Amino acid sequence: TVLIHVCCAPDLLTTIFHVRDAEFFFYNPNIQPLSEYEKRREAVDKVANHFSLNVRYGEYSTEEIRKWYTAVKRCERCISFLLERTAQEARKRGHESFSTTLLASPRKNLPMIENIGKTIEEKYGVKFFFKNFRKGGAYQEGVRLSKELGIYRQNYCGCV
Ligand code: SF4
Ligand SMILES: [Cl-]
Ligand SMILES: [Zn+2]
Incomplete structure (x- = not known):
């Protein structure tokens, strides 16, 4: 079983075209202010209820934001912070692998994410699952599903 960090609903939609049995972990203290975190969280919750996904919601608090x-x-730095928490959670909950929907994300740097994931794997002993999540047209498939579900598609990465 794999625990997959979730950044946003559009990238979750791209990801679930290809992953069959995952637990998802919405953890993003980088997103500010609270109204924007909640907007993004509610869109993920809408996708999870639509497709009966297993999503867990991590801590979002003043302290978590200070860390x-x-x-x-x-x-x-930012991505390593998020995936470290994810791999910690994966070990606590008995998942032998971890990943992230940031791998679906058209802007992001796949080599940098895979490098971070492999470094975290060596530290925690949880395998990092890499996939070209946008491949298989899944990306355009995620767009089509975002439109259909009327899912919030954001306009910036999250941080201030
Ligand atoms: S833009 Fe901000 S929130 Fe997005 S990865 Fe970079 S530091 Fe993190
Ligand atoms: Cl994102
Ligand atoms: Zn995202």
């Missing part, structure tokens, strides 16, 4: 701010090249 992230202390951590943040800055995107390398």
Whole structure:
């Protein structure tokens, strides 16, 4: 079983075209202010209820945001912070692998994410699952499903 960090609903939609049995982990203290975190969270919840996904919602609090701010090249930091928490959760909950929907994400740097994931794997002993999540047309498939579900598609990465 694989625990997949979720950044946003559009990238979750792309991802679920190809992953069959996952637990998802919405953890993003980088997203501010609270109204934007909640907007993104509610869109993920809408996708999860539509497709009966198993999503867990991580901590979002003043403290959690301070931990992230202390951590943040800055995107390398940010992504490593999110995936470290994910791999910690994967070990706690007995998942032998972890991944992230950031791999679906058209803007992001696939080599940098795979490098971070492999480094975190070596630290925690949870296998990092890499996939070209946009491949298989899945990306345009995620767009079509976003439109259909009327899913919030954001306009910036999340942080201030
Ligand atoms: S742009 Fe995105 S990846 Fe880079 S620091 Fe901000 S939230 Fe993190
Ligand atoms: Cl994103
Ligand atoms: Zn995303």
